[PDB]
Design a protein around this ligand. Structure first.
Ligand SMILES: Nc1ncnc2c1ncn2[C@@H]1O[C@H](COP(=O)(O)OP(=O)(O)O)[C@@H](O)[C@H]1O
Ligand SMILES: Nc1ncnc2c1ncn2[C@@H]1O[C@H](COP(=O)(O)OP(=O)(O)O)[C@@H](O)[C@H]1O
Ligand SMILES: O=c1[nH]cnc2c1ncn2[C@@H]1O[C@H](COP(=O)(O)O)[C@@H](O)[C@H]1O
Ligand SMILES: O=c1[nH]cnc2c1ncn2[C@@H]1O[C@H](COP(=O)(O)O)[C@@H](O)[C@H]1O
Ligand SMILES: NCCC[C@H](N)C(=O)O
Ligand SMILES: NCCC[C@H](N)C(=O)O
Ligand SMILES: [Cl-]
Ligand SMILES: [Cl-]
Ligand SMILES: [K+]
Ligand SMILES: [K+]
Ligand SMILES: [K+]
Ligand SMILES: [K+]
Ligand SMILES: [Mn+2]
Ligand SMILES: [Mn+2]
Lengths: 342, 342
């Protein structure tokens, strides 16, 4: 049971219900890097930039291949670091490295000297049978002999999205965290990131609509950013609703959402509205055990009433960008995909 | 110490704190009636409809001659009740009657068998020197004999507004109630109620503006009428702020004010905003001792910073109308006014 502790009090509190201790890189981009090491050289299979930030298990984050926001200069740090790590541990075959980017600063989160659950996606994305290769490598044939020496960078956008079992265990709080709960995955391919993403979202069984009313209820650290997001939804013709504190910040920015009541606050409240088909979209962020626990009802209602919802601001943005795309506009075969690869 | 208690708890509460017990006529129109009785007949000198409802001392209420909302039918009833009273108590000279209208029903508040403070204004408004006339009657000269037998209903509107000393005693909660606190009064003469009012308002040293942002923070009972108020303001070009509860009702009605925190809710709050010059107008109603005591800050801030404020919705509405008039437009002398009385 891993948990993010915010303060001293918090510490104890976990401790009771309860040891490695790590500092939580808040407001960090999480990255996945799959690579092969033949001993001579190192092939970078792919660099995946997660939509959801560090603190939300790789296993449950959507991810984009190539990175949709990261700087070449930084990818480059990780590129260099992995190489460094590959040779150092003596990687003979596949490997995976997970980083965390915070303030143009690369932090090593973990190294998995084996096949990661990211390979296939990465293989599909790049047209490079990553496993076959490391397989051939482990046995004795080099990256060099394989003529599999250069790192591929597709002409298109490959986004990976996950599917969660929440609907099977309704008593659970359908919320993202440090622990993985997802069962499967989908892949979205688009000319643009927004395209790919919309593809991955539709593919993941999302109920997200392109119209109606959105509900914004975010955590403190998300209050600043939520503005742009809200701006985006307004531009798309979404009508807005917001909880008190979230409504405060919005207003301070020229945006006047409809104020909605929390459960304990009166009527009607979020639950009633949700239940009444009042929303087509919900952006809900929450931080801290107690808070989470207290906000449970919205997520539960949302899931239950099939309202598309995001539990990360990063995830809200993606959802928004995707509103500008048409996931049924254009299809492309995988063979065509790899054909496009020079 | 004259207070209005709402519930049993309230009763006691006062009782510890502190006997005549009267049923409070909530949401009632207060009226003043000045008249003369020569024992032979009764002369109606003036029927004044207060802007502020019963519960706000007559002396601190703005008022209009002729009535601006009362039905002729209801006024006529009053006129008869006055007559009755006059005769019965043996009035010989001036008299004054105070009523409350609730649900198309007339209630007697009190009877002051003497010259009331409304006498000068009524005189000015009607061109009839009630004091002189009444003095005559007292002296033996009858109404018939003096040739003053018909009630005068002027061709223009006369609005009286008061001035309060709260500024002199910053420590006092600048709020209206059942006890009189005002030191003076002014008169506004207009072709319409809106005009008389605007004139009365301006002469009262009101800092009211015709543009800007308005703060709405009203009590439960006022939550319903507030919407129309908000609309009217919106129409006038004003922008809107509002406290939580008030915002909620507004939202439900299609009005999305900009949310503002209560002093104790955090920042940014009303005090901050008021202080910073965000508002040009403030509409704040509050009921019940504790509630009053708690909101005190909003009223104290409004005054200190010179923002125009109304503590009654009836007042807020009058203000609203006045926005549609120009007190600097037309001027009229008393002589001219009296001359129009045919
Ligand atoms: N120090 C940290 N700061 C931020 N996020 C972290 C940190 N450690 C772990 N995480 C998050 O938790 C996830 C799981 O941690 P990780 O060490 O990779 O565990 P696992 O072995 O279960 O895959 C990561 O994918 C990441 O989102
Ligand atoms: N029963 C009542 N219902 C509503 N308002 C009332 C009632 N009794 C008095 N008031 C309010 O209190 C004020 C003062 O009461 P009043 O009997 O006229 O006392 P005073 O001797 O001060 O003139 C009135 O002008 C009115 O606004
Ligand atoms: O009905 C509720 N009860 C408790 N918490 C809620 C409820 N609805 C939303 N929240 C949480 O409220 C937070 C936003 O609060 P705000 O700061 O007042 O806008 C988010 O972290 C939400 O998950
Ligand atoms: O800063 C404050 N502290 C306490 N009460 C306030 C404050 N500002 C406004 N009020 C009161 O809040 C009421 C409106 O509350 P609302 O229903 O949440 O909008 C009014 O009756 C106001 O007098
Ligand atoms: N990639 C995880 C699934 C996303 C889900 N809508 C959430 O934001 O909670
Ligand atoms: N007629 C009394 C003055 C009104 C004041 N603006 C208030 O509404 O409190
Ligand atoms: Cl369950
Ligand atoms: Cl003082
Ligand atoms: K992540
Ligand atoms: K691991
Ligand atoms: K009154
Ligand atoms: K009296
Ligand atoms: Mn991991
Ligand atoms: Mn009285």
């Amino acid at each position: 049971a891993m948990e993010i502790v915010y303060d001293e009090a918090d510490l104890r509190r976990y401790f009771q219900t309860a040891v490695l201790l790590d500092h939580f890189l808040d407001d960090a981009v999480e990255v996945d890097v799959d690579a092969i090491c033949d001993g001579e050289m190192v092939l970078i299979g792919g660099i995946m930039e997660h939509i959801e930030q560090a603190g939300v298990h790789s296993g449950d984050s959507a991810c984009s291949l190539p990175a949709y926001t990261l700087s070449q200069e930084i990818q480059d740090v990780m590129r260099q670091q992995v190489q460094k790590l590959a040779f150092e541990l003596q990687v003979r075959g596949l490997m995976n490295v997970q980083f965390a980017v915070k303030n143009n600063e690369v932090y090593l989160i973990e190294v998995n000297p084996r096949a990661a659950r990211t390979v296939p996606f990465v293989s599909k994305a790049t047209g490079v049978p990553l496993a076959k290769v490391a397989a051939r490598v482990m046995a004795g044939k080099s990256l060099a002999e394989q003529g599999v020496t250069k790192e591929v960078i597709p002409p298109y956008y490959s986004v990976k999205e996950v599917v969660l079992p929440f609907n099977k265990f309704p008593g659970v709080d359908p919320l993202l965290g440090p622990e993985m709960r997802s069962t499967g995955e989908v892949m979205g391919v688009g000319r643009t990131f927004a395209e790919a993403f919309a593809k991955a979202q539709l593919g993941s069984n999302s109920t997200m609509k392109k119209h109606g009313r959105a509900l914004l209820s975010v955590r403190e650290g998300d209050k600043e950013r939520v503005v742009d997001l809200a701006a985006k939804l307004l531009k798309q013709g979404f009508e807005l609703d917001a909880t008190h504190g979230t409504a405060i910040v919005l207003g301070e920015a020229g945006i006047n959402p409809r104020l909605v009541n929390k459960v304990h606050e009166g009527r009607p409240h979020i639950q009633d509205r949700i239940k009444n088909g009042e929303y087509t979209y919900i952006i809900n962020t929450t931080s801290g055990r107690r808070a989470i626990e207290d906000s449970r009802v919205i997520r539960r209602s949302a899931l239950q009433y099939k309202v598309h919802y995001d539990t990360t601001l990063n995830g809200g943005f993606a959802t928004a960008m995707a509103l500008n795309a048409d996931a049924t506009e254009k299809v492309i075969s995988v063979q065509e995909m790899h054909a496009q690869i020079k």
